[PDB]
Amino acid sequence: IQMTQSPSSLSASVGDRVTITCRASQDVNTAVAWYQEKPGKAPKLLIYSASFLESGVPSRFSGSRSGTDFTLTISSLQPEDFATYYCQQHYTTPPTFGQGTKVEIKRTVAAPSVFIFPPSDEQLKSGTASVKCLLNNFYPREAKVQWKVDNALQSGNSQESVTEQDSKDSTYSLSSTLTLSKADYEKHKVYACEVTHQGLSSPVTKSFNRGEC
Amino acid sequence: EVQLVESGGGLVQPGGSLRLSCAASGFNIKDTYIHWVRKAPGKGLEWVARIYPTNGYTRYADSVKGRFTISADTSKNTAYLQMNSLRAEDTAVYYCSRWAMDYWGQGTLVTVSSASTKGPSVFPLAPSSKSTSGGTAALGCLVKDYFPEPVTVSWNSGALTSGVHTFPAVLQSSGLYSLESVVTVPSSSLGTQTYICNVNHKPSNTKVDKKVEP
Numbered sequence: 001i002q003m004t005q006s007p008s009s010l011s012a013s014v015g016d017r018v019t020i021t022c023r024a025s026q027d028v029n030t031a032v033a034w035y036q037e038k039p040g041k042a043p044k045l046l047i048y049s050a051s052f053l054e055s056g057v058p059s060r061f062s063g064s065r066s067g068t069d070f071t072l073t074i075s076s077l078q079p080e081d082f083a084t085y086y087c088q089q090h091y092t093t094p095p096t097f098g099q100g101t102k103v104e105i106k107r108t109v110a111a112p113s114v115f116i117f118p119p120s121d122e123q124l125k126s127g128t129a130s131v132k133c134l135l136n137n138f139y140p141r142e143a144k145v146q147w148k149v150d151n152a153l154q155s156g157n158s159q160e161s162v163t164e165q166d167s168k169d170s171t172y173s174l175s176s177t178l179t180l181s182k183a184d185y186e187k188h189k190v191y192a193c194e195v196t197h198q199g200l201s202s203p204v205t206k207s208f209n210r211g212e213c
Numbered sequence: 214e215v216q217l218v219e220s221g222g223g224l225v226q227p228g229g230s231l232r233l234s235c236a237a238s239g240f241n242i243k244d245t246y247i248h249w250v251r252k253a254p255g256k257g258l259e260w261v262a263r264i265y266p267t268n269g270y271t272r273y274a275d276s277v278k279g280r281f282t283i284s285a286d287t288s289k290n291t292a293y294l295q296m297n298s299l300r301a302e303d304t305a306v307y308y309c310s311r312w313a314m315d316y317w318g319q320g321t322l323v324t325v326s327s328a329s330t331k332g333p334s335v336f337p338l339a340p341s342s343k344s345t346s347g348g349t350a351a352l353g354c355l356v357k358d359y360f361p362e363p364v365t366v367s368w369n370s371g372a373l374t375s376g377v378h379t380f381p382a383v384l385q386s387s388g389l390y391s392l393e394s395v396v397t398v399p400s401s402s403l404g405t406q407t408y409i410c411n412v413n414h415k416p417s418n419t420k421v422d423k424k425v426e427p
Contacts, residue, residue, distance in 0.1 A: 093272050095260050159383050
């Protein structure tokens with residue numbers, strides 16, 4: 001018995017009405033629970049037996065069943081309700097879980113602040129070279145980083161890491177790393193990070209000249 | 214207050230064995246079912262096994278049948294998961310729960326890998342000299358080439374927390390992890406304040422403090 005959960009993610013405002021659905025592959029009667037998960041925390045029971053509220057769980061949370069379909073509704077979204085939600089059937093063994101739904105908080109557009117970092121002299125001495133581009137406190141999450149080395153477009157030699165939504169201003173930050181051998185690094189002069197984002201009227205470029213203090 | 218505490222996780226070789234424990238408080242496990250449930254890095258929740266401590270009856274996911282054994286000792290109010298013939302695929306946070314699953318532990322991390330522990334090098338990400346006067350500057354630390362996860366980073370021994378971003382680790386082509394921690398600070402503080410990242414890699418017993426200078 002598989003639990004097909006939709007959607008994978010959604011953004012919403014405090015006070016909103018939120019709807020998460022879960023489709024079971026075959027009949028499971030009412031033996032369905034809904035769980036809330038937050039980074040590095042125990043999952044928490046919200047609703048048991050399709051529609052019953054767990055003691056201590058605020059009466060803004062509700063669940064309903066119609067046939068094979070199960071629905072988790074949050075009547076009026078509160079700040080603490082930002083999390084990932086999973087459905088579960090326990091009709092038979094093995095019990096199975098949905099893929100989850102991440103509920104994120106919508107806010108106004110915010111352009112990133114952009115910073116570029118050369119490889120440190122220390123890293124260069126240890127034998128490697130990493131060039132980094134930081135995109136600080138932006139919304140929405142979608143953002144494009146383009147690396148240029150002496151005006152030549154880079155492809156397939158960079159990796160990105162992105163933070164979860166900030167608990168104070170609801171933004172994202174992003175770290176991009178251009179990976180090059182130390183010998184390759186010294187073959188070129190101007191390193192550039194070009195950033196495209198909805199909050200930017202036109203793409204912003206940060207650059208440095210290799211070796212410049 | 215019902216509590217469940219997992220222990221026993223850590224780094225082990227493929228084909229090896231590891232025993233997890235689940236210590237229960239605030240209720241008696243004779244009265245319930247105890248489950249193990251796991252979450253692999255980006256895979257979602259997967260039920261592993263269940264036991265009824267009263268009669269010792271067990272059920273297992275097909276993926277672990279035979280090579281895992283769940284057990285319980287009611288006199289210790291503790292359940293166990295004996296894992297054998299471990300595979301890379303078994304790498305996960307393991308949770309125990311009780312019966313819907315109304316209480317869960319915080320989980321314990323199991324990593325199945327042939328790779329050896331390696332402590333990180335820590336490199337400074339110095340604030341740029343073309344940083345705007347009276348504006349905002351960025352600086353950070355690169356915590357490179359460690360295994361396994363996790364690493365923790367603080368700034369100035371915890372006194373600096375505002376404007377810090379410690380990024381999720383990146384798995385490099387080498388099979389070693391790297392991560393950055395950055396912070397934005399007033400430009401006016403660069404020649405007058407000291408900024409130190411405090412890095413902890415507990416799997417290798419590595420503690421490093423790195424001063425980040427302009």
